[PDB]
Amino acid sequence: AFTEDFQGLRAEVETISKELELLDRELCQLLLEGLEGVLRDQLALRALEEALEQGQSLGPVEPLDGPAGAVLECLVLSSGMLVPELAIPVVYLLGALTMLSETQHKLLAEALESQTLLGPLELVGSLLEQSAPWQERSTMSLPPGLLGNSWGEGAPAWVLLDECGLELGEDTPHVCWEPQAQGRMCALYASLALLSGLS
């Protein structure tokens, strides 16, 4: 099949997330503080994406200024040589972030700062799981409010999902699945799951 299901998406993400749990906690905290600043600055988001390339630079990586440099410091040794253990997962994250809007990046920044990644991660993951098959439009039964999320026009979870192309409503049905939202909803899930794995 062309597509994957949420099970396959989850499996794919977990190949990266599984070994983030063995990463040193002090690293992940510094990395998460750096990623917060990167998610708040589109330019640093692009600067970091270029510096890492895709992790295949044979030589040392030159240090950078600002948030991009803050993240980059966490991924290199004393020489500036990237540690694939740390760089590749960040590359995967940056790849998924390319599909999201700056509005979503800053919403993810707020989630990092307040350490509230599990909420949106479950809402996005549950919508992906209950929207099968993704190529079909479908009104959905899940009310995000009954998961403990603030739900309403302008709410973080609203804007986060509205930016993916979903058709949102104040009342039932709160969410209608749109096939065009597949890629951004999947990338959104991956970005949340990778960030959460670091937390």
Numbering used by the authors: 282 to 480
Give the original sentences from the paper that presented this experimental model.
Gasdermin D (GSDMD) is the central executioner of pyroptosis, a proinflammatory type of cell death. GSDMD is activated by the proinflammatory caspase-1 and caspase-11 via proteolytic cleavage in the linker connecting its N-terminal and C-terminal domain (GSDMD^Nterm^, ^Cterm^). The released N-terminal domain is sufficient to form pores in the plasma membrane, resulting in swelling and subsequent rupture of the cell.
Here, we report the crystal structure of the autoinhibitory C-terminal domain of GSDMD at 2.04 Å resolution to further analyse determinants of GSDMD activation. To obtain pure and soluble hGSDMD^Cterm^, the native hGSDMD caspase-1 cleavage motive _272_FLTD_275_, was replaced with a tobacco etch virus (TEV) protease cleavage site (ENLYFQ↓S, with cleavage occurring between Gln (Q) and Ser (S)) in the expression construct GSDMD^TEV^ ([Fig fig1]). In iterative cycles of manual model building and refinement, the model was refined to R-work/-free of 0.23/0.26 at a resolution of 2.04 Å in space group P2_1_2_1_2 ([Table tbl1]). GSDMD^Cterm^ adopts a compact all alpha-helical fold with ten alpha helices (α1- α10) and dimensions of 36.5 x 56.2 Å ([Fig fig2]). The ten helices can be grouped into five N-terminal (α1- α5) and five C-terminal (α6- α10) helices, with α1, α2 and α5 interacting with α6, α7 and α10 to form the core of the protein. The helices α2, α3 and α4 are connected by two long loops of fourteen and ten aa length, respectively, and form a helical bundle interacting with α5 and α6 ([Fig fig2]). In the crystal structure of hGSDMD^Cterm^, the four C-terminal linker residues (A282, F283, T284, E285) have been modelled but are already characterized by increased flexibility.
